[PDB]
Amino acid sequence: AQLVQIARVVHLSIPSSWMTLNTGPYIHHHAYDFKPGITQPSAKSRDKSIWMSPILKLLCTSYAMTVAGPVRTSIVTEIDGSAAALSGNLRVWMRDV
């Protein structure tokens, strides 16, 4: 599965306005969901990263595209709750709908 293919499972899609830009590689290797030297370890997605990382990358690139000016590297720095708690709640919501 591709990044967007899996990220759409929670209705995270690509805006039509982006369809004229080469966003692929940026989302692939410029939106760090876990930079070792910056992220707090609490945000470490661990094994669920296989399906967690695309979601975080989509959120990161969305924020980066939001601000004006040149495109900058996007990095997750912290999740207030543990990444495990976030994954658990997401699984609950996925099961609910």
Binding site for another protein (CB under 8 A): 11-12, 15, 17-18, 36-37, 40-42, 44-47, 49, 58-59, 62-63, 65-70, 72, 82, 84-85, 88-89, 91-92
Neighbours of 83 (CB within 10 A): 23
Q: Which amino acid is at 3?
A: L
- 25 or 69: CB nearest another protein: 69
Comparison of 9 and 85: residue with beta carbon closer to another protein = 85
Q: 74 near 37, Cβ under 8 Å? A: no
Of the pair 92, 97, the CB lying nearest another protein is at 92
Angle at 29 between CA 49 and CA 31, to 5 degrees: 70
**Residue 78 in tokens:** 């912290």
Residue 6 C-beta: closest distance to another protein, Å: 16
> Given the complex with another protein, which of 28 and 91 has the nearer CB atom?
91
Q: What is the closest distance, in whole angstroms, from the C-beta atom of residue 21 to another protein in the complex?
A: 8
Q: d(Cα 70, Cα 66) in Å, to the nearest integer?
A: 11
